Amino acid sequence: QCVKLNDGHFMPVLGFGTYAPPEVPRSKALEVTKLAIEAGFRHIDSAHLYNNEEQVGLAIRSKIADGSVKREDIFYTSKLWSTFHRPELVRPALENSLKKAQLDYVDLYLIHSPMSLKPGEELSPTDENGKVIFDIVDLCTTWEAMEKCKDAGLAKSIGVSNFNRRQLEMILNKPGLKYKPVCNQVECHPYFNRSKLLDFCKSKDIVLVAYSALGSQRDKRWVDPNSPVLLEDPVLCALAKKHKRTPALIALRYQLQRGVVVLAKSYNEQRIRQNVQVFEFQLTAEDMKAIDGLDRNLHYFNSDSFASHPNYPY
Amino acid sequence: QCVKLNDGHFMPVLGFGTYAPPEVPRSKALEVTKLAIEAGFRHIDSAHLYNNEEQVGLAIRSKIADGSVKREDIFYTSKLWSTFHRPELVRPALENSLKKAQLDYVDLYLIHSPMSLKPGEELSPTDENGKVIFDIVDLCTTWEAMEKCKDAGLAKSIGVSNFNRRQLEMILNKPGLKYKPVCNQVECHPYFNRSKLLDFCKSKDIVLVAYSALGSQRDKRWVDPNSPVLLEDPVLCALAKKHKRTPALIALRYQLQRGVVVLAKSYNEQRIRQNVQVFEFQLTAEDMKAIDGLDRNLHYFNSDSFASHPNYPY
Ligand SMILES: NC(=O)c1ccc[n+]([C@@H]2O[C@H](COP(=O)([O-])OP(=O)(O)OC[C@H]3O[C@@H](n4cnc5c(N)ncnc54)[C@H](OP(=O)(O)O)[C@@H]3O)[C@@H](O)[C@H]2O)c1
Ligand SMILES: NC(=O)c1ccc[n+]([C@@H]2O[C@H](COP(=O)([O-])OP(=O)(O)OC[C@H]3O[C@@H](n4cnc5c(N)ncnc54)[C@H](OP(=O)(O)O)[C@@H]3O)[C@@H](O)[C@H]2O)c1
Ligand SMILES: COc1ccc(Cn2nnc(O)c2C(=O)Nc2cccc(C(F)(F)F)c2)cc1
Ligand SMILES: COc1ccc(Cn2nnc(O)c2C(=O)Nc2cccc(C(F)(F)F)c2)cc1
């Protein structure tokens, strides 16, 4: 099943998340994306940052070439990284991603983050003390260059990621705006359910796409170990026994019933196949209200290293 | 016990809250304020808004005159209401409060709220449609007039209420500042524990004073009846059984042990006397961590009707 976007295109409502940390050998991205397509995923989320577009692209091409799917069946997303916000760098960045993935177009191209960083060869440019150097860019001129990538046919739709309400309206109030963002991809899960931002996006016809919907990978470089584990929540567990499903399936189904497009990362064959069961069952209105009550405005991303940035989203 | 303010004065760490809704006869404010002092409260929180300074001042005068306390034993607070923010109105507002209470000085005078309103005869001046008429006032000039009240001896200390971090820094960075705010009185409780604002206040030697620390009076005009009842929270009930106290006493001790000065409203003779039991027991470090985990960013006051004010604090 799909949702219609505000530019006419369609986005599958369950997406496969492809990020894995550097400890995971790069060959795994090829194997698991193939397994994701075989299991039923049609929405595939990647990025320049993830250092896996070559392998994710190869998996998509193989499933087209072996005759399982057609290119028009697959919805592939990439993202413009934050050292490429200056508008003359936007289209070269996208053409680079296409060359690495061996695709002619991406279905969706996002501004990865509102926090511009210094242009250069390094992905996370730092000074002598490991402090990350910021760049001052008007994101409305980044958006202009993004719109040109749409008109060029290199991206079917364009959107944003990690933008707050204030940063969204800075784009919606751009003089001469040609294309609204079709979506805003942000952290979203029952401990941080974004109800206020979701209603705002609904009011402007912008899809909210949830990442870390299963509670994140709890990587210690960015996630505090002492934070509570979402998939161990007692309410999620109670509902998992009730419906004879799992806590992950409850968390995924919660998002679908509130109009949120949901991503799910797994590099485990059996869990990949399990996650497509989300279309098989249904939560009652009372179940939904009990999940609603778990909201704590707890975001797992320790972004506090970067609150200095003028465009810090939190 | 008391905490030392950054101006050398001292503030008792447990305060009595005097606000009652209009349906409560004004005579009760006199009666319960005498009961609070008799039970041991020495810090008394009132305001122009509350329409009770006459009865509360009379209660304090009665307990001095009958020999129970001296004036120097009582710490009395009033607040400058939002329609008197213009500097020429500030001292006359304090003089009027002192006349109504028949006191020679207040121990503490606060800017009640950063949201300036149109001067006039109504607490909340409204126009033809029902929208409350705002006012545009440099709050730095309001503070200068507050400083002249301390110089005259009409207020021993001065402070603010319902300020966020940015509004505090605008005062702290003011050129020619003579007196920092001694405190910021804000909504604070286990569902909205203000840890970040607390740390900032500690870093500047400003005391955080907690209101609605028992979960508010759940007035239907301001508080959604669907929000959770703080005093029925299962975690607070369990800690209450361990220490052989009550949920309210757990919530009040929680604040004292993190360096927060805590207010407690009660118009019931037994509950007024119970609340001074906070000095009788302690919470373990593990107890404090379990209360810390309740934080939800839930503020009970439905202030969204005022979200359009330039100085909206949320
Ligand atoms: N725009 C952004 O800034 C941003 C930020 C973060 C993430 N994202 C995107 O969102 C995707 C997913 O978000 P995430 O990476 O935070 O991970 P996630 O989707 O929150 O899921 C995280 C963990 O859940 C486990 N899991 C998956 N299915 C499960 C199941 N059925 N039962 C139990 N455990 C299960 C996985 O471990 P196993 O792999 O061992 O199953 C995975 O490590 C990322 O891959 C990336 O594409 C975007
Ligand atoms: N600066 C501001 O803008 C602002 C805003 C709100 C409040 N305040 C100040 O802070 C004060 C208190 O905050 P609040 O008015 O929100 O009320 P609160 O202190 O959160 O207490 C709320 C309720 O707790 C009940 N209670 C008291 N002791 C109890 C006990 N031991 N066991 C069980 N229930 C108990 C009282 O009901 P009974 O009366 O039936 O005991 C009271 O209605 C106010 O009176 C006012 O002075 C300031
Ligand atoms: C639970 O929160 C998490 C956030 C990130 C990750 C790692 N990660 N995985 N996939 C991705 O796209 C990313 C990633 O770094 N995003 C990002 C990049 C720059 C700035 C920001 C923000 F605006 F949020 F500050 C976010 C894992 C979990
Ligand atoms: C739980 O939250 C509650 C807040 C207020 C009340 C009623 N109340 N009782 N004593 C008081 O001083 C007040 C009061 O209206 N304060 C106030 C006035 C103007 C603006 C603001 C703020 F800046 F917060 F929006 C606060 C009850 C509950």
Curated annotation (Swiss-Prot), chains A, B:
Q: Where is this site: Lowers pKa of active site Tyr?
A: 79
Which residues make up the binding site for NADP(+)?
18-19, 45, 161-162, 185, 211-217, 265-267, 271-275
**Where does the source fall among the domains of life?**
Eukaryota
Q: In which tissues is it expressed?
A: Expressed in many tissues including adrenal gland, brain, kidney, liver, lung, mammary gland, placenta, small intestine, colon, spleen, prostate and testis. High expression in prostate and mammary gland. In the prostate, higher levels in epithelial cells than in stromal cells. In the brain, expressed in medulla, spinal cord, frontotemporal lobes, thalamus, subthalamic nuclei and amygdala. Weaker expression in the hippocampus, substantia nigra and caudate.
Indicate how activity is controlled. Answer: Strongly inhibited by nonsteroidal anti-inflammatory drugs (NSAID) including flufenamic acid and indomethacin. Also inhibited by the flavinoid, rutin, and by selective serotonin inhibitors (SSRIs). The oxidation reaction is inhibited by low micromolar concentrations of NADPH.
Any keyword Oxidoreductase?
yes
The record ties this protein, via CDD domains, to: AKR_AKR1C1-35 (cd19108)
Keywords linked to the UniProt accession? Cytoplasm, Lipid metabolism, NAD, NADP, Oxidoreductase
Which Gene3D superfamilies does the record match to this protein? NADP-dependent oxidoreductase domain
One GO biological process this protein is involved in is: steroid metabolic process
Q: Where is this site: Involved in ligand recognition and product release?
A: 222, 301
Please describe, based on the UniProt annotation, the reported consequence of changing residue 70 to E: No effect on 17beta-HSD activity
Sites annotated Important for substrate specificity: 49
Query: What's one GO MF term for it?
Result: retinal dehydrogenase activity
Task: Give the PROSITE patterns listed for this entry.
Answer: ALDOKETO_REDUCTASE_1, ALDOKETO_REDUCTASE_2, ALDOKETO_REDUCTASE_3
Pathway linked to the protein: Steroid metabolism
List the record's Gene Ontology CC terms alphabetically.
cytoplasm; cytosol; extracellular exosome; nucleus
Q: Altering residue 170 to I: what's the impact?
A: No effect on 17beta-HSD activity
Q: Active site: which residues?
A: 50
Q: Where in the cell is it found?
A: Cytoplasm
Which positions in this protein are listed as binding substrate? Answer: 112
Function, in words: Cytosolic aldo-keto reductase that catalyzes the NADH and NADPH-dependent reduction of ketosteroids to hydroxysteroids. Acts as a NAD(P)(H)-dependent 3-, 17- and 20-ketosteroid reductase on the steroid nucleus and side chain and regulates the metabolism of androgens, estrogens and progesterone. Displays the ability to catalyze both oxidation and reduction in vitro, but most probably acts as a reductase in vivo since the oxidase activity measured in vitro is inhibited by physiological concentration of NADPH.
Write out the similarity annotation. Answer: Belongs to the aldo/keto reductase family.
PANTHER family membership: ALDO/KETO REDUCTASE (PTHR11732)
State what protein this is by name. Aldo-keto reductase family 1 member C3
* Annotated source species: Homo sapiens (Human)
